[PDB]
Design an enzyme around this catalytic site. Sequence first.
Site, PDB file in Angstrom:
ATOM      1  N   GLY A 156      21.035  23.767   3.080  1.00 60.50           N
ATOM      2  CA  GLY A 156      19.680  23.227   3.037  1.00 60.50           C
ATOM      3  C   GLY A 156      19.558  21.778   3.478  1.00 60.50           C
ATOM      4  O   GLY A 156      18.615  21.445   4.205  1.00 60.50           O
ATOM      5  N   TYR A 163       7.868  14.947   7.232  1.00 55.16           N
ATOM      6  CA  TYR A 163       7.065  14.267   6.221  1.00 55.16           C
ATOM      7  C   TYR A 163       5.824  13.703   6.852  1.00 55.16           C
ATOM      8  O   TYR A 163       5.913  12.726   7.584  1.00 55.16           O
ATOM      9  CB  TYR A 163       7.853  13.114   5.559  1.00 55.16           C
ATOM     10  CG  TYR A 163       8.994  13.609   4.724  1.00 55.16           C
ATOM     11  CD1 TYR A 163       8.806  13.954   3.388  1.00 55.16           C
ATOM     12  CD2 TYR A 163      10.268  13.764   5.267  1.00 55.16           C
ATOM     13  CE1 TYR A 163       9.852  14.457   2.620  1.00 55.16           C
ATOM     14  CE2 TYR A 163      11.311  14.295   4.514  1.00 55.16           C
ATOM     15  CZ  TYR A 163      11.099  14.634   3.190  1.00 55.16           C
ATOM     16  OH  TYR A 163      12.135  15.120   2.435  1.00 55.16           O
ATOM     17  N   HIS A 174      15.863   6.542  -5.417  1.00 47.98           N
ATOM     18  CA  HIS A 174      16.893   7.580  -5.440  1.00 47.98           C
ATOM     19  C   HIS A 174      17.990   7.296  -4.476  1.00 47.98           C
ATOM     20  O   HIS A 174      17.813   6.520  -3.549  1.00 47.98           O
ATOM     21  CB  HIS A 174      16.257   8.949  -5.071  1.00 47.98           C
ATOM     22  CG  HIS A 174      15.789   9.017  -3.650  1.00 47.98           C
ATOM     23  ND1 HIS A 174      14.657   8.318  -3.220  1.00 47.98           N
ATOM     24  CD2 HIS A 174      16.332   9.662  -2.590  1.00 47.98           C
ATOM     25  CE1 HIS A 174      14.567   8.541  -1.925  1.00 47.98           C
ATOM     26  NE2 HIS A 174      15.565   9.331  -1.493  1.00 47.98           N
ATOM     27  N   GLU A 176      20.738   9.864  -2.033  1.00 45.49           N
ATOM     28  CA  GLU A 176      20.673  11.199  -1.461  1.00 45.49           C
ATOM     29  C   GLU A 176      21.426  12.205  -2.323  1.00 45.49           C
ATOM     30  O   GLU A 176      22.247  11.824  -3.179  1.00 45.49           O
ATOM     31  CB  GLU A 176      21.238  11.208  -0.030  1.00 45.49           C
ATOM     32  CG  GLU A 176      20.485  10.301   0.926  1.00 45.49           C
ATOM     33  CD  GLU A 176      19.010  10.615   0.958  1.00 45.49           C
ATOM     34  OE1 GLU A 176      18.650  11.716   1.411  1.00 45.49           O
ATOM     35  OE2 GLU A 176      18.218   9.791   0.466  1.00 45.49           O
ATOM     36  N   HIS A 262      17.097   3.805  -2.506  1.00 42.45           N
ATOM     37  CA  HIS A 262      15.937   3.404  -1.727  1.00 42.45           C
ATOM     38  C   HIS A 262      14.671   3.992  -2.288  1.00 42.45           C
ATOM     39  O   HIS A 262      14.712   4.991  -2.979  1.00 42.45           O
ATOM     40  CB  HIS A 262      16.094   3.736  -0.222  1.00 42.45           C
ATOM     41  CG  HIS A 262      16.543   5.142   0.030  1.00 42.45           C
ATOM     42  ND1 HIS A 262      17.859   5.526  -0.185  1.00 42.45           N
ATOM     43  CD2 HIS A 262      15.840   6.215   0.444  1.00 42.45           C
ATOM     44  CE1 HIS A 262      17.917   6.800   0.121  1.00 42.45           C
ATOM     45  NE2 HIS A 262      16.730   7.263   0.498  1.00 42.45           N
ATOM     46  N   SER A 274      13.770  13.827   8.930  1.00 41.96           N
ATOM     47  CA  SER A 274      14.997  13.450   8.281  1.00 41.96           C
ATOM     48  C   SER A 274      15.902  14.600   8.009  1.00 41.96           C
ATOM     49  O   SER A 274      15.480  15.738   8.016  1.00 41.96           O
ATOM     50  CB  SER A 274      14.685  12.743   6.965  1.00 41.96           C
ATOM     51  OG  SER A 274      14.107  13.668   6.061  1.00 41.96           O
TER      52      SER A 274
HETATM   53  C1  LIG Z   1      16.530  18.994  -0.830  1.00 38.54           C
HETATM   54  N1  LIG Z   1      16.408  17.552  -0.663  1.00 38.54           N
HETATM   55  C2  LIG Z   1      15.399  17.012  -1.568  1.00 38.54           C
HETATM   56  C3  LIG Z   1      15.320  15.499  -1.461  1.00 38.54           C
HETATM   57  C4  LIG Z   1      14.963  15.110  -0.031  1.00 38.54           C
HETATM   58  C5  LIG Z   1      14.829  13.625   0.128  1.00 38.54           C
HETATM   59  C6  LIG Z   1      15.816  12.690  -0.168  1.00 38.54           C
HETATM   60  N2  LIG Z   1      15.441  11.456   0.104  1.00 38.54           N
HETATM   61  N3  LIG Z   1      14.180  11.592   0.593  1.00 38.54           N
HETATM   62  C7  LIG Z   1      13.532  10.467   1.142  1.00 38.54           C
HETATM   63  N4  LIG Z   1      14.369   9.485   1.492  1.00 38.54           N
HETATM   64  C8  LIG Z   1      13.880   8.548   2.306  1.00 38.54           C
HETATM   65  C9  LIG Z   1      12.604   8.550   2.808  1.00 38.54           C
HETATM   66  C10 LIG Z   1      11.741   9.547   2.380  1.00 38.54           C
HETATM   67  C11 LIG Z   1      10.351   9.554   2.803  1.00 38.54           C
HETATM   68  O1  LIG Z   1       9.918   8.861   3.701  1.00 38.54           O
HETATM   69  N5  LIG Z   1       9.590  10.476   2.212  1.00 38.54           N
HETATM   70  C12 LIG Z   1      10.066  11.347   1.318  1.00 38.54           C
HETATM   71  N6  LIG Z   1      11.293  11.426   0.937  1.00 38.54           N
HETATM   72  C13 LIG Z   1      12.161  10.530   1.478  1.00 38.54           C
HETATM   73  C14 LIG Z   1      13.784  12.874   0.604  1.00 38.54           C
HETATM   74  C15 LIG Z   1      15.993  15.710   0.918  1.00 38.54           C
HETATM   75  C16 LIG Z   1      16.052  17.220   0.713  1.00 38.54           C
HETATM   76 ZN   LIG Z   2      16.220   9.419   0.629  1.00 34.78          ZN
END
Ligand SMILES: CN1CCC(c2cnn(-c3nccc4c(=O)[nH]cnc34)c2)CC1
Ligand SMILES: [Zn+2]
Length: 337
Positions: A156, A163, A174, A176, A262, A274
């Site tokens: 996944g 987004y 959070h 990653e 971040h 992303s």
């Molecule tokens: C299954 N996973 C859930 C968490 C998901 C995830 C992890 N980090 N993340 C984000 N980080 C950085 C920027 C953004 C952003 O601009 N919008 C929303 N989410 C973001 C989104 C990845 C997929």
């Molecule tokens: Zn992130």
Amino acid sequence: LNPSARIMTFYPTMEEFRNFSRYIAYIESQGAHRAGLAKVVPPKEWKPRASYDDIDDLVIPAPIQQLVTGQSGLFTQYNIQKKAMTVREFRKIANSDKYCTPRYSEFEELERKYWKNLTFNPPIYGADVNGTLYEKHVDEWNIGRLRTILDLVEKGVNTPYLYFGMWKTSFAWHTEDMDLYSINYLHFGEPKSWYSVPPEHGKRLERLAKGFFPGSAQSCEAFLRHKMTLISPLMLKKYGIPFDKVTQEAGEFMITFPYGYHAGFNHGFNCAESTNFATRRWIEYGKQAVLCSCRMVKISMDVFVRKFQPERYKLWKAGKDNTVIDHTLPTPEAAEF
Ligand SMILES: CN1CCC(c2cnn(-c3nccc4c(=O)[nH]cnc34)c2)CC1
Ligand SMILES: [Zn+2]
Ligand SMILES: [Zn+2]
């Protein structure tokens, strides 16, 4: 390199840009990873898609209304799933009088309006859409197929997500999943502002968060993984937590590094793409990642320990692998630089 752990910006030539994994190794050799976040401006001639005038029929299956609760720079975000909508429908709402960006001269003014009004008029985030805006022929920095060692899980979090933002839509503090890296490309639209905490200071952010939300912390080992906690840069300043800020504009990449905390927000209607990715340096972070104990995303590290650390496999399986992560060290791939 990078003793201040400040967010670095890179301007690769077309030749340097071509090799993704090699360029990640290069920016780490420069100390980019110390900030936990880096910006990469691609060469002007490079485009992942010729035009974005053909994506109005793209479906956002689960748009989320972002309800925020709190005061004094401390907030909790609650997601309410709304019915499916097209990008055409989402753009109409995003640009309407109810949800459009307020008038502003400098970023600092908009940043103030965000922190002052994030609990009012909950916006809609067209988040976590499985998909890509890259044309199939694009071989450079293709978020849909980066072909890093993270592919070993499949071969996944190894698939692309879209987004669609509007003014005041947010991403909470959070790291990653599995403390992996991430790549974020802003395809078009209004900017996306980011806050970052250097990986070497991540434990300080966690201690601050635990002290503010003791109920959440008792309920889960890694509550910050829920992506519901918003903390203002002024609240971080107040408690001496080191952080940096950066504004990502259309056509720019942001790279997050393992254990790089971040958070951020969208200035208005936009679209980012992303995915997660790995390097040999990540394996140790994946092995040591503190995961959510109440719900979640879990990758078996076994395949990675077998392939890249065979001499450590029996020690690791026994739970006797006592490796301490130095957050300042670049990935072994950076050796050539
Ligand atoms: C299954 N996973 C859930 C968490 C998901 C995830 C992890 N980090 N993340 C984000 N980080 C950085 C920027 C953004 C952003 O601009 N919008 C929303 N989410 C973001 C989104 C990845 C997929
Ligand atoms: Zn992130
Ligand atoms: Zn949890």
